[PDB]
């Protein structure tokens, strides 16, 4: 076997061994087994594909219980009747990237819930109109003449 001065053994003497680069580190945040991953075609025909990841939020034990309860409130609009949190990404042609996007959303949800950020976010324009409309609804509220 040919070995030159630029052999990986000579370049990286501490990293010698035929198995050095191929070992799987033993020491796992999102368990793929616990997720139901489906693939379909988004409007296809539209070029981009679609990947859907759904799991039962309450049963999931890989998410902390307090985190589970705060995600249910924040993302109540993504939880169906059966209690499964449904995420979907259709931004790519490749199922891999669509699944990677869905998995990153799960990681972002858990991060946001644990962060408990108290920073005051800038009010969206649609929310501003609702604030005025809610204020006037409270202003019409009355009290019983004889309580």
């Amino acid at each position: 076997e040919f070995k030159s001065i630029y052999s990986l053994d000579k370049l990286y003497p501490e990293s010698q061994g035929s198995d050095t680069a191929w070992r799987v580190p033993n020491g796992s945040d999102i368990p793929l087994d616990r997720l139901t991953i489906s693939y379909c075609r988004s409007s296809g025909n539209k070029v981009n594909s679609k990947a859907e990841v759904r799991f039962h939020l309450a049963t999931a034990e890989w998410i902390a219980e307090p985190v589970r309860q705060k995600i249910a409130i924040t993302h109540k609009n993504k939880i169906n009747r059966l209690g499964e949190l449904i995420l979907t990404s259709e931004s790519s042609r490749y199922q891999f990237r669509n699944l990677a996007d869905c998995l990153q959303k799960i990681r972002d949800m858990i991060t946001e819930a644990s962060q408990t950020p108290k920073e005051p976010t800038k009010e969206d324009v649609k929310l501003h109109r609702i604030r005025i409309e809610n204020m006037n609804r409270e202003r019409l509220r009355q009290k019983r003449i004889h309580s």
């Binding site: 539209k46 070029v47 981009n48 109540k76 609009n77 169906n80 009747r81 790519s92 042609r93 490749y94």
Partner: protein, 54 residues
């Protein structure tokens, strides 16, 4: 309202979205004289690189 659908009416809750008409573009021509380079992007379905036969 979710409670009414899920519990009282025993059904899945219908969600709706306001969808706008797709944007108009004139028929694409082979030589778009004096149009900017981004003219071609107006008629592109995907943003990811394509390689054809290769």
């Amino acid at each position: 309202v979710t409670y009414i659908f899920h519990q009282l009416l025993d059904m899945r809750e219908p969600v709706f979205e306001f969808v706008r008409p797709p944007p108009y573009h004139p028929k694409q021509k082979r030589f778009p004289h004096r149009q900017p380079l981004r003219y071609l992007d107006r008629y592109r379905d995907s943003h990811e690189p394509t390689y054809g036969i290769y």
